[PDB]
Each structure stands twice: as structure tokens, then as C-alpha cells.
Scaffold this active site. Structure first.
Site, PDB file in Angstrom:
ATOM      1  N   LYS A  86       0.781  -1.177  -0.022  1.00 41.44           N
ATOM      2  CA  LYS A  86      -0.015   0.066  -0.065  1.00 41.44           C
ATOM      3  C   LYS A  86       1.003   1.021  -0.064  1.00 41.44           C
ATOM      4  CE  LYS A  86      -4.311  -1.147   2.806  1.00 41.44           C
ATOM      5  NZ  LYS A  86      -4.797  -1.151   4.108  1.00 41.44           N
TER       6      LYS A  86
ATOM      7  N   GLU B 122      -6.187  -4.251  10.597  1.00 39.83           N
ATOM      8  CA  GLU B 122      -7.019  -2.953  10.856  1.00 39.83           C
ATOM      9  C   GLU B 122      -7.607  -2.885  12.126  1.00 39.83           C
ATOM     10  OE1 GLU B 122      -7.476  -1.560   7.134  1.00 39.83           O
ATOM     11  OE2 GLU B 122      -6.459   0.218   8.137  1.00 39.83           O
TER      12      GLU B 122
HETATM   13  N1  LIG Z   1      -0.392   4.783   4.290  1.00 36.76           N
HETATM   14  C1  LIG Z   1      -0.245   3.613   4.924  1.00 36.76           C
HETATM   15  O1  LIG Z   1      -0.767   2.298   4.383  1.00 36.76           O
HETATM   16  C2  LIG Z   1       0.622   3.737   5.916  1.00 36.76           C
HETATM   17  C3  LIG Z   1       1.177   2.602   6.742  1.00 36.76           C
HETATM   18  C4  LIG Z   1       2.324   2.900   7.767  1.00 36.76           C
HETATM   19  C5  LIG Z   1       2.640   4.269   7.860  1.00 36.76           C
HETATM   20  N2  LIG Z   1       2.106   5.250   7.117  1.00 36.76           N
HETATM   21  C6  LIG Z   1       2.608   6.689   7.256  1.00 36.76           C
HETATM   22  O2  LIG Z   1       3.837   6.876   7.960  1.00 36.76           O
HETATM   23  C7  LIG Z   1       3.730   7.723   9.160  1.00 36.76           C
HETATM   24  C8  LIG Z   1       3.921   7.125  10.720  1.00 36.76           C
HETATM   25  O3  LIG Z   1       5.412   6.274  10.387  1.00 36.76           O
HETATM   26  P1  LIG Z   1       6.716   6.451  11.291  1.00 36.76           P
HETATM   27  O4  LIG Z   1       6.325   6.135  12.661  1.00 36.76           O
HETATM   28  O5  LIG Z   1       7.378   5.583  10.707  1.00 36.76           O
HETATM   29  O6  LIG Z   1       6.831   7.796  11.436  1.00 36.76           O
HETATM   30  P2  LIG Z   1       7.186   8.999  10.483  1.00 36.76           P
HETATM   31  O7  LIG Z   1       7.834   8.698   8.971  1.00 36.76           O
HETATM   32  O8  LIG Z   1       5.924  10.039  10.579  1.00 36.76           O
HETATM   33  O9  LIG Z   1       8.324   9.793  11.501  1.00 36.76           O
HETATM   34  C9  LIG Z   1       8.030  10.819  12.286  1.00 36.76           C
HETATM   35  C10 LIG Z   1       9.321  11.425  12.628  1.00 36.76           C
HETATM   36  O10 LIG Z   1      10.637  10.780  12.783  1.00 36.76           O
HETATM   37  C11 LIG Z   1      11.731  11.354  12.058  1.00 36.76           C
HETATM   38  N3  LIG Z   1      12.434  10.287  11.824  1.00 36.76           N
HETATM   39  C12 LIG Z   1      12.759   9.153  10.991  1.00 36.76           C
HETATM   40  N4  LIG Z   1      13.729   8.357  11.487  1.00 36.76           N
HETATM   41  C13 LIG Z   1      14.140   8.930  12.263  1.00 36.76           C
HETATM   42  C14 LIG Z   1      15.235   8.223  13.394  1.00 36.76           C
HETATM   43  N5  LIG Z   1      15.872   7.266  13.123  1.00 36.76           N
HETATM   44  N6  LIG Z   1      15.586   8.935  14.351  1.00 36.76           N
HETATM   45  C15 LIG Z   1      14.898   9.998  14.626  1.00 36.76           C
HETATM   46  N7  LIG Z   1      13.965  10.598  13.937  1.00 36.76           N
HETATM   47  C16 LIG Z   1      13.397   9.768  12.838  1.00 36.76           C
HETATM   48  C17 LIG Z   1      10.935  11.949  10.944  1.00 36.76           C
HETATM   49  O11 LIG Z   1      11.137  11.471   9.822  1.00 36.76           O
HETATM   50  C18 LIG Z   1       9.903  12.525  11.850  1.00 36.76           C
HETATM   51  O12 LIG Z   1       9.600  13.985  11.848  1.00 36.76           O
HETATM   52  C19 LIG Z   1       2.124   8.389   8.747  1.00 36.76           C
HETATM   53  O13 LIG Z   1       2.202   9.565   7.960  1.00 36.76           O
HETATM   54  C20 LIG Z   1       1.485   7.094   8.390  1.00 36.76           C
HETATM   55  O14 LIG Z   1       0.388   7.110   7.301  1.00 36.76           O
HETATM   56  C21 LIG Z   1       1.058   5.126   6.379  1.00 36.76           C
HETATM   57  O1  LIG Z   2      -3.333   3.401   4.754  1.00 36.52           O
HETATM   58  P1  LIG Z   2      -4.294   2.577   5.074  1.00 36.52           P
HETATM   59  O2  LIG Z   2      -5.307   1.800   4.458  1.00 36.52           O
HETATM   60  O3  LIG Z   2      -5.024   3.496   6.248  1.00 36.52           O
HETATM   61  O4  LIG Z   2      -3.798   1.289   5.876  1.00 36.52           O
HETATM   62  C1  LIG Z   2      -2.679   1.307   6.909  1.00 36.52           C
HETATM   63  C2  LIG Z   2      -2.725   0.062   7.692  1.00 36.52           C
HETATM   64  C3  LIG Z   2      -2.089  -1.371   6.605  1.00 36.52           C
HETATM   65  C4  LIG Z   2      -1.855  -2.403   7.472  1.00 36.52           C
HETATM   66  O5  LIG Z   2      -1.038  -3.271   6.606  1.00 36.52           O
HETATM   67  C5  LIG Z   2      -1.076  -2.241   8.918  1.00 36.52           C
HETATM   68  O6  LIG Z   2      -0.954  -3.648   9.677  1.00 36.52           O
HETATM   69  C6  LIG Z   2      -1.754  -1.282   9.542  1.00 36.52           C
HETATM   70  O7  LIG Z   2      -1.247  -0.979  10.983  1.00 36.52           O
HETATM   71  C7  LIG Z   2      -1.783   0.254   8.905  1.00 36.52           C
HETATM   72  O8  LIG Z   2      -2.176   1.474   9.456  1.00 36.52           O
HETATM   73  O1  LIG Z   3     -12.334  -1.930  13.341  1.00 38.24           O
HETATM   74  S1  LIG Z   3     -11.481  -2.068  14.609  1.00 38.24           S
HETATM   75  O2  LIG Z   3     -10.844  -0.844  15.030  1.00 38.24           O
HETATM   76  O3  LIG Z   3     -11.324  -3.188  15.348  1.00 38.24           O
END
Ligand SMILES: NC(=O)c1ccc[n+]([C@@H]2O[C@H](COP(=O)([O-])OP(=O)(O)OC[C@H]3O[C@@H](n4cnc5c(N)ncnc54)[C@@H](O)[C@@H]3O)[C@@H](O)[C@H]2O)c1
Ligand SMILES: O=P(O)(O)OC[C@H]1C[C@@H](O)[C@H](O)[C@@H](O)[C@@H]1O
Ligand SMILES: O=S([O-])[O-]
Ligand SMILES: NC(=O)c1ccc[n+]([C@@H]2O[C@H](COP(=O)([O-])OP(=O)(O)OC[C@H]3O[C@@H](n4cnc5c(N)ncnc54)[C@H](O)[C@@H]3O)[C@@H](O)[C@H]2O)c1
Ligand SMILES: C=C1C[C@@H](O)[C@H](O)[C@@H](O)[C@@H]1O
Ligand SMILES: O=S([O-])[O-]
Ligand SMILES: [Co+2]
Ligand SMILES: [Co+2]
Lengths: 367, 360
Positions: free
Chosen positions: B140, B242
Site C-alpha cells: 500500500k 486493521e
Molecule cells: N499509508 C499507509 O498504509 C501507511 C502505513 C504505515 C505508515 N504510514 C505513514 O507513516 C507515518 C507514520 O510512520 P513512522 O512512525 O515511521 O513515522 P514518520 O515517518 O511519520 O516519522 C516521524 C518523525 O521521525 C523522524 N525520523 C525518522 N527516522 C528517524 C530516526 N531514526 N530517528 C529520529 N527521528 C527519525 C521523521 O522523519 C519525523 O519527523 C504516517 O504518515 C503514516 O500514514 C502509512
Molecule cells: O493506509 P491505510 O489503508 O489506512 O492502511 C494502513 C494499515 C495497513 C496494514 O498493513 C497495517 O497493519 C496497519 O497498521 C496500517 O495502519
Molecule cells: O475495526 S477495528 O478498530 O477493530
């Protein structure tokens, strides 16, 4: 007429005929979709858009979204703005996007639909003969970057296609001509008896009846899908649909909108035939067969060719919209034929290396 | 450690361990890519970015493209700017995009990569535990629209994934926790009597060694891929991932950046458990089991339900019949509740609202 089109296991019904849209209710399940977002570039006649909207309106609420036409606005930015406006109309996963236009609207709407919620229903209503007989018979979707045409996109099938042959029959002859060029490409590249017209049915005015266009659409469906059903990405045997495109696309850029895509391609196929003959691949009679079919549709007759040789070469060596154009320093890969119906293979691919000498020569001598 | 990951017929090697980028020449051939466009949002420590540029440079020219981080800038417009800049640098069909960052950088580079020439090589270097153990285990890809989160995207697999456990072992504890919440979610939704760790190995400070994180990643690979290998679009059995996300997404919105995605999910799971209980699916003991495991990882600690139930419930009804909303529920730990051949169970809006009101 209704044909079932399948790109591997992704199938859609392509219905084509007079007033197909007034029969839309017979083709789409009553409650398949809860809303129609109708997308159409600003150059499509308002009478077609409003007509399509009234028929889709019998199934579910319709909203009309126009955007600014032209290759300058065929961009991800135009796509985002359309997705935002759609969401503001309450679009969701049960919405269908209805693309009402030629290939430009098809592409823009296909990129929109393929990304919204990671993919919603895309329905084509092609209003140009080229879109109906060629571009909706492809699952490629793409838009432009400032540094190039069709540089960003992906592969995304529709759920339905409706081509109204009465609309197509009243379209501009220069546009019918453009799609007729690709139809004649299909005649030159692939062996056929599975066509229900002869070369007698081609005319140089490019004015055809709804029924004749129906029969042309049927032949293009058979021809293209005989290849693309299995080669969905158009990376293998599907390269054949790029016959005349290598030089054709460069001429098309050099002429900067002065010539249609089909016209550039027609010239590009004449060049490819002459090249294949100068390389000993193709008999002279087969070259003459190219001129003979293209003259039947009046392809070479008009053609305001205003660019110089050097500009055409520039666009050709700086082009990225197809992979593997320039092989090495001396050679470009081209789709060539050994004869009408007979693609030339080289190393298990359809790309024959062609010396830049022969390419510059044919470009400079023109027609 | 290398695991082959297969989404149907589209496979990649996921290499993970300490100084994993030091050994990059053992995974990708020399010939393979002419160039590496390394994309990282501005929030990624520059040391990690330069560190990764250094090792990919042993293979081919690397250009680094930074873009403004943050969910406000995670849009198709950032993607276009990244693509245009990559084209200006001579990017082509033989270029690989190397996404060095968390899930935000992954998603932005994922969309960028999925679209350029209708698809070039995507390489993940996940630098957060959430990305390494969850978001990289999904094909995704998505970015935001004005009207909401992740509304535009597609499915697109990567060619390689490299997770350096040393980098992950030194990431902020709150960030590790966020990925530990999704790990707990995996524990709660799937049956597994043969984990290489126990509940005793989970701590609330969210401080682990590189090897402990490698063990968690391996656990997450097995858990998600046991389901996603077949359900590649996550539309069937993959809906399980989910769990906690229906109310989770809405809590995460209501809090305005104040809690992490795992924390929001953690709370959403507790409410899903309470819900399944009020609906006679889940015994009270399995509800306590949710609290017990999440408290092992300190999931509920930094949590500020600074929100009223009404703000949460509003975001929930605005999130994309009239009395019910579908939820993934469980009958018990490891036991998804099926409804009418699907993992989606209709749940009364009024019930959701009352459980949210009641709180933790
Ligand atoms: N669309 C999807 O299905 C999906 C799934 C999972 C995550 N995501 C996206 O990723 C985001 C959350 O993921 P996340 O927790 O990885 O965080 P992120 O990418 O949002 O990171 C948060 C912060 O961590 C920093 N960062 C990255 N590596 C670091 C490190 N090693 N040390 C210190 N700081 C660091 C930054 O990039 C940032 O300011 C959301 O926008 C989420 O939508 C999307
Ligand atoms: O971008 P979406 O459809 O909101 O899906 C995201 C999810 C995708 C799924 O593979 C993962 O286990 C979840 O934790 C994650 O939040
Ligand atoms: O639908 S979920 O949040 O269990
Ligand atoms: N998806 C594919 O594989 C594929 C294939 C071929 C072409 N395309 C794309 O299609 C575009 C060219 O397509 P096209 O030839 O259909 O033209 P087009 O979409 O560029 O339309 C040409 C002009 O005709 C207008 N128009 C449309 N219907 C009309 C009608 N009935 N009467 C009068 N005007 C009408 C348009 O608004 C426009 O100003 C390019 O963007 C090209 O790359 C995509
Ligand atoms: C690029 C394409 C795709 C192919 O399917 C068509 O035949 C071509 O004419 C069109 O230009
Ligand atoms: O233009 S073609 O025939 O490669
Ligand atoms: Co063409
Ligand atoms: Co999650």
C-alpha cells in the site's frame, strides 16, 4: 454491440453503437455505484457532456467536473484538483468516474480514478475515434511532467466502456483521420481476415456512418486484444502498436501541434517501411502497400510538415516516453516489418537496431 | 538476516541486522541500477541519510533529495516536485528510488517510484521501528489530500528492503512504542504458540537491543506475511491488520498530532474489545488481556485523551446502513469474529459512542 475485453483477468464490457448511452441502464447494475463523477476536458463539446450526464443520471446522481484542456494542463496537478473537487462532492469507494472525452480526458480521469482510495471504478465514454479505437484499448494511464510527456502514471483498467458511434460519426474528419491512421497501422502489422470491411470501405474524406465506425471499432478490438490480452503492459509483442511511433513521436513534437498523432504515425510508418526495405528486411511491394493504404484514408495528402530535419532528430535522441530508443552511439531500436502482417524479430524482441545513417536519411528526404 | 517476502508473485529480500547497509553489495548486483535517488523527508537525522548515501555510492551515483517532512506536506504536489527533480538529475528506467525514513518518507517515495515511467525500483531503508516492522510489510502506498489522510495512492511493491537494527535500537522510545503497539496487535489477532519471545520480553520503556528488534521484525514478517502473501490488497483476511484502526484513525485525528498512530491503535483495540464484549462475542477475560499486553509496552502511558468523546465520534462518522458502522472484532485473543463470510461486523453507532464516552 458489446464485446468483453480482458487484460489478463481484468475484464470490462465495451459497448459501442448508436445511442449506447440511452441503453446504459441495461449494462450497469441498478445499484452498482452510488454516484457518477463525470470528468471532461474543456474542449469536449458541452452537448456531448450534458447528454452523457442525463443518461448516467438515470442510474444515480451525476456531477460534472470540467478541467482545462491541452497537453500543458495534462498534469498530476490537474488530477489532484479533480480528486479534491470529487471528494468535496462526497465521492467515495462506491463512486464511478466517467471520463467523457478523447485520450487526454481518458488519461487524466484514469490517473484520478486509479489513485482515489487506491482505485475506484473508471468508465470510459470516448468521444474521439482515436480514443474509442485505440486509447481505451490500452490500460496505460499517464500525465505529463514539465520535462516530458507521459512520464508519470501506471496501469489501470476500466470497468466499462461506452462508445456512441453517432457521436463519433459527427466528429471532426481530421480527428477521425487520426484514429484511421492507427487502424491502418493495425492492418499493416497484424494478419487479419477477422475484419468485416475491405479497403473499399476506406474513404479519403474521413466521414463515416455510425455503422462503419462500429465495424472499425470491432476490428481494432480484435486486433489489439489478440496481443494485449496477454501482454497487458505492452512490453513484449505489444510493442507492435508502436509501429511508426519511434520517428512519428519525434515529428509530432517537432511540429508542435501542427500535425495530429495519427498523421505523425502515418509518416513514421512510411519511414519504417523504407528503412526495413533499405535494410533488406522488406520487399518493395510491401513498402508500396503502405503508401497504398495510407492514401486510401487520405493520410499523406494534407500534412502541414513545417519542421526542419535537425529539430526532428533533436526530439528523437532526447526522448524518454519509451524505453530503449537509443541502443548505442550509432543505433536506435525500431519496430520494423519484414512484410505486411509480418513483424521483424531481432534477438527475441520486436526492436531491430537501426543505424542512425538510415534514420537521418529518411527524415531529411521526407515524402 | 534476510527473508524473502512474496506478495503473490512479486518478491523481495528483506535484509535486517546491524550495519546492514555496509553489506549492500551482497544483495544488489553492480549492473542492476545506474543511479540511486535517495529520498528522505526533512525530519530524518542527516547522519542516517549521509550514512546510507555513502554505501549506495559503492554501487552507483547517489543523489539525495530532501523534502519538507510532516503530514501537511505529504501530498501529490510533493511527489511531483520529487519526480521533476529526479528527472532534472537524469533519472531513468534503470534508476532506483531509495526511501530512507519512516512511513511518511516510504509512502512519498513509494508513490513517486510507482509512477515514474509507470514504475521504477523502490528500495526501502526504514529508519523507524513502525516502518521496519509494519509499513514496509504492505505494498500500500498513499499520500494525503486536503480532505483527508491517505486518500490517494495505489499498491506497489519494493525491490529490496534494508533495516538497520542498530539505527532502530537508537530511535526515540516513543517511536519504538508506536511500532510495538502494532506488534501487540499482531499478538492479539493471530494465534502463535511458537514465538521466539514472551510477554516477559516486552518492556514499557521501549528500549531494546539491535537483536531484540531483529527478533520483533522477524515475528512481524511471519505474522503479516502468513496472511498478506495471498491477500495482497489487504481486502479479505488481511483486514485483520486493521484491528483497533476504526476508532484508532479517529482518535489519531482528534488528538491533532498529540499521540502516535500506535497509541491511537492501542486505544482503538481496547474499545474494539469492549465493543465485542457488549456484543456477546468476547469474554471479559480477553478484554483484560488487551489491557494487560498493552500495559506491558507502556501503550497507555503518554496518552492524553485531551479529547471529548464527541470530537472522536465526529471524526469517526466523517472517515472514509445508517445505524451501524463495520468493525474488525474478535471473539477472543487470536480469534477473529467472522460475520456473514467477512471480518467486518456491523456495530451500532450508538454503542461505539457509548464505549468511547466511558473511556479507559
Ligand atoms: N499509508 C499507509 O498504509 C501507511 C502505513 C504505515 C505508515 N504510514 C505513514 O507513516 C507515518 C507514520 O510512520 P513512522 O512512525 O515511521 O513515522 P514518520 O515517518 O511519520 O516519522 C516521524 C518523525 O521521525 C523522524 N525520523 C525518522 N527516522 C528517524 C530516526 N531514526 N530517528 C529520529 N527521528 C527519525 C521523521 O522523519 C519525523 O519527523 C504516517 O504518515 C503514516 O500514514 C502509512
Ligand atoms: O493506509 P491505510 O489503508 O489506512 O492502511 C494502513 C494499515 C495497513 C496494514 O498493513 C497495517 O497493519 C496497519 O497498521 C496500517 O495502519
Ligand atoms: O475495526 S477495528 O478498530 O477493530
Ligand atoms: N491510454 C493510452 O494507451 C493512450 C493511447 C493513445 C493516446 N493517449 C493520449 O490521448 C491524447 C490524444 O487523444 P485524442 O486523439 O482522443 O484527442 P484529445 O483528447 O487530445 O482531444 C482532442 C480535442 O478534441 C476535443 N474533443 C473530444 N471529443 C470531441 C468531439 N466529439 N468533437 C469535437 N471535439 C472533441 C478535445 O477536448 C480536444 O480539444 C494524448 O494525451 C495521448 O497521449 C493515451
Ligand atoms: C502509446 C500508444 C499505446 C498503444 O496501445 C497504441 O496502439 C498507440 O497508437 C498509442 O500511441
Ligand atoms: O517507428 S517504428 O516503426 O519503430
Ligand atoms: Co499512437
Ligand atoms: Co497501523
Amino acid at each position: 454491440t458489446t464485446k468483453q475485453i480482458c487484460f489478463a483477468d481484468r475484464c470490462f464490457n465495451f459497448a459501442f453503437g448508436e445511442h449506447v448511452l440511452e441503453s446504459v441502464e441495461s449494462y450497469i447494475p441498478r445499484d452498482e455505484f452510488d454516484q457518477y463523477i463525470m470528468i471532461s476536458d474543456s474542449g469536449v463539446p458541452d452537448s456531448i457532456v450534458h447528454y452523457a450526464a442525463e443518461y448516467f443520471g438515470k442510474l444515480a446522481p451525476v456531477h460534472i467536473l470540467r478541467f482545462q484542456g491541452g497537453e500543458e494542463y495534462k498534469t498530476l496537478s490537474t488530477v489532484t484538483n479533480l480528486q479534491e473537487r470529487a471528494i468535496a462532492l462526497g465521492a467515495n469507494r462506491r463512486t464511478a468516474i466517467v471520463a467523457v472525452g478523447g485520450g487526454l480526458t481518458g488519461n487524466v480521469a484514469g490517473v484520478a480514478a486509479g489513485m482515489m482510495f487506491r482505485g475506484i471504478a473508471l468508465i470510459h465514454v470516448p468521444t474521439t475515434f482515436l480514443a474509442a479505437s485505440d486509447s481505451v484499448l490500452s490500460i496505460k494511464q499517464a500525465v505529463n511532467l514539465t520535462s516530458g510527456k507521459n512520464l508519470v502514471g501506471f496501469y489501470y483498467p476500466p470497468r466499462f466502456v461506452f462508445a456512441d458511434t453517432r457521436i463519433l460519426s459527427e466528429s471532426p474528419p481530421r480527428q477521425v483521420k487520426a484514429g484511421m491512421c492507427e487502424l491502418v497501422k493495425n492492418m499493416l502489422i497484424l494478419e487479419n481476415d477477422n475484419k468485416e470491411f475491405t479497403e473499399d470501405d476506406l474513404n479519403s474524406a474521413n466521414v463515416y456512418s455510425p455503422k462503419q465506425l462500429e465495424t472499425f471499432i470491432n476490428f481494432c478490438i480484435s486486433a489489439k486484444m489478440s496481443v494485449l490480452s496477454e501482454d497487458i503492459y505492452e512490453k513484449k509483442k505489444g510493442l507492435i502498436f508502436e509501429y511508426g511511433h519511434t520517428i512519428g513521436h519525434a515529428i509530432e513534437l517537432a511540429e508542435q501541434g501542427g500535425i495530429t498523432h495519427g498523421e505523425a504515425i502515418a509518416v513514421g510508418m512510411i519511414y519504417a517501411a523504407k528503412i526495413a526495405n533499405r535494410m533488406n528486411l522488406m520487399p518493395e511491394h510491401d513498402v508500396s502497400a503502405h503508401y497504398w493504404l495510407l492514401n486510401k484514408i487520405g493520410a499523406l495528402q494534407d500534412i502541414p510538415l513545417k519542421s526542419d530535419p535537425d529539430s526532428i532528430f533533436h526530439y528523437l535522441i532526447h526522448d524518454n516516453k519509451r524505453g530503449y530508443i537509443k541502443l548505442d552511439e550509432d543505433n536506435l531500436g525500431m519496430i520494423l516489418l519484414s512484410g505486411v502482417g509480418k513483424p521483424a524479430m531481432y534477438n527475441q524482441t520486436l526492436l531491430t537496431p537501426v543505424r542512425k545513417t538510415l534514420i537521418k536519411e529518411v527524415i531529411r528526404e521526407g515524402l
